Design a protein. Sequence first.
Lengths: 163, 71, 28, 32, 234, 171, 134
Amino acid sequence: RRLKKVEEEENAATLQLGQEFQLKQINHQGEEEELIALNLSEARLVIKEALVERRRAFKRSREKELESIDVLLEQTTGGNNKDLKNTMQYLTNFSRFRDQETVGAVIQLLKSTGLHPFEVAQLGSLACDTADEAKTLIPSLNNKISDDELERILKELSNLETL
Amino acid sequence: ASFLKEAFRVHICGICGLMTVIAKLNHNQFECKGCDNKIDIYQIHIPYAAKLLFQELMAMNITPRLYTDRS
Amino acid sequence: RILGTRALQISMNAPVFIPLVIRREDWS
Amino acid sequence: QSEETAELDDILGQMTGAFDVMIDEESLVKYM
Amino acid sequence: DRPIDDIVKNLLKFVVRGFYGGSFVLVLDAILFHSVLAEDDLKQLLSINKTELGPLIARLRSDRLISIHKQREYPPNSKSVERVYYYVKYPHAIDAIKWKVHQVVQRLKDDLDKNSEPNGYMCPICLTKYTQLEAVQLLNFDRTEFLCSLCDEPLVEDDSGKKNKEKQDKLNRLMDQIQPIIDSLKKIDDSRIEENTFEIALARLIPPQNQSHAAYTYNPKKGSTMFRPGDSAP
Amino acid sequence: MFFIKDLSLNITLHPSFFGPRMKQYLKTKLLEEVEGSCTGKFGYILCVLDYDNIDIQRGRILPTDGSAEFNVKYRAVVFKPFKGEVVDGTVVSCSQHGFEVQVGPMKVFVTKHLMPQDLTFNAGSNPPSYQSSEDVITIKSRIRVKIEGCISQVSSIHAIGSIKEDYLGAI
Amino acid sequence: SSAPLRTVKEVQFGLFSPEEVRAISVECPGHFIKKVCECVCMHCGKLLLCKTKMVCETDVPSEDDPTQLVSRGGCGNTQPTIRKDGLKLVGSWKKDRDEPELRVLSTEEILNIFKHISVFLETLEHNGAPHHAI
Ligand SMILES: [Zn+2]
Ligand SMILES: [Zn+2]
Ligand SMILES: [Zn+2]
């Protein structure tokens, strides 16, 4: 007994990400796990960490970074990789946390707030100086987090920024 | 039963079983207006007579909904 | 259907060594 | 012509049908 | 008679004279001046033929500003004939007016909201409009203009970019011209109006003619359990 | 936005690959058919995590095709855009209709109506640009865009962008 | 085609609601009573309890205690003896206190009643067209 029903439009401001990107997702093992949203720096390391392992298996059996990632991509990935090349190139040119240690600090820093995973990913991907910029660029933060806490979190985020 | 089986490809919406999916195969686009969906399409190989039967049923206000999953 | 299944597979340039199991409980 | 050759309901040009045929990875690695 | 009747009649008079033509004013005012009025008597009063009275009655019945009542009459001189009477059911007409006023205002509000949104490109050859989101996927390799999927012709930007101010004036004009309806409705809501019926309406009858063939009386059949749709009121 | 999503696929193997290394071919098919592909339901699929730990169920032989259908479960990083999101990118193309911003594997379109009134289109300058007394927008420039809408097809995604709101524009 | 190839597993027959027909209506695949009336009341749409029952029974005796009536949702209108004349449904009422009252059950009346039951011409009426013509 399934047919057309009214479905909320996928909107980031209302944190309505759709039907597949809900809060709790049943993984392949069948366990219930929260959604995993990654900022630009976290995603770059995850993609980078996967490619190196892929290259390791194959072999066994900031401008400099752009070249190194490209050569790895062409070596460890097959054809029709035009999209991944842009993503890695775009991630290195828009990431404010190059070091793994810095990324770990960012996750520990923002995880105290307890906000929705989409919101925390946005807070680490966008360079926000004032609380108003974070409140207007991420409408979901409105009234969810106090200005004082937001101001210090942004201040501390810029403290651990590198390069 | 292989000999018995041994033709027409139609697109069926995933929410409604009707063969009302406007398929712009040139642009690789599918849409079922009235269901406002474009990512829940399936294609089924049914005899052209079967397609005629379902369309005739749709003319008599009958909704034969071909679903690819068992409830 | 195994006899026809492998016959089609062989006709489609499949290597010949019937690694198929009948899903009646699965049996080889 | 081929090498092989309001109520809910189960003419549709569909199917040997009693039993399915699956492939075996355990046996493929051993035959070669 | 009562203050309620006067205000309700004024609302009906205002709606007819403004939102309807001229002959409609004649027809409804005749059945407001009088109680339930026979079709033959109405024709004599306005001196209009059946072909001209029919269109007026049909449009007024569609909006439920006038109700119909058919009953059999038995005159000794002639054989039994069926007579048609027209009257006004204030609860029905007032509800219809309230719904239409809200719909008209909402439609203008929706049009104003829609107009403020970005325009959607249209194809001249096939006259098939495309929204901004739909047109974005029609970009060509050189990315100069949107090309129609069917015609393969450059898209032309649609109009209505300048009407952003005209619709606001239209809404302003309507609310000013429609103010009397809202004011009258507020007073009606404050009080409670009884639903009228052919028998009840007959209590205020002013006969149009001296020897009208229509016997303006309600003689229901004895013990008749039959019920017609919309034949009784609370 | 980037997510780590648990996805499933139905791969089809031609009978020519029924050998001891059949599993290896399936992994290659996943890397060549999934990576770099666009799916409206889940968005762009960038990388496949846990390459060694891909779980493959028993394949089913199609009656009249002879090919084997394999259901493959894998963990992959995907990029699904959403309206109301704020993203950064570099302008790649410009024209009278509007400039396009490259946000990862997606291209965001900023229509002439959505951009502020101050910005004006000039084509005499090579390359063409959108110029405002404060800033200038041209190819290779970095622009912060807000996605105002997304149309997700079964095999493609397109979106529109806007810089009308404050704190959006040249970075 | 890019859509997945699947096999039809179920066929759910049903009826087209008016909304679906309008919404559905636009290699190509092409682009597009009597029994119930005697069971429900023709004035409120509630089940009488059914053909034998010719009254809505606004008040029914209480099951727990006899001679203690309990009020039930009803309108106490005597039901007609519905008969099929041609392609229309003609209802005949039996007056309490002598031919029965007969009138044609307009499809609009039946449509209204069926909509109260508790998932799967224009030119003429527009102007004139006395009731006989309509
Ligand atoms: Zn549908
Ligand atoms: Zn065209
Ligand atoms: Zn009843």
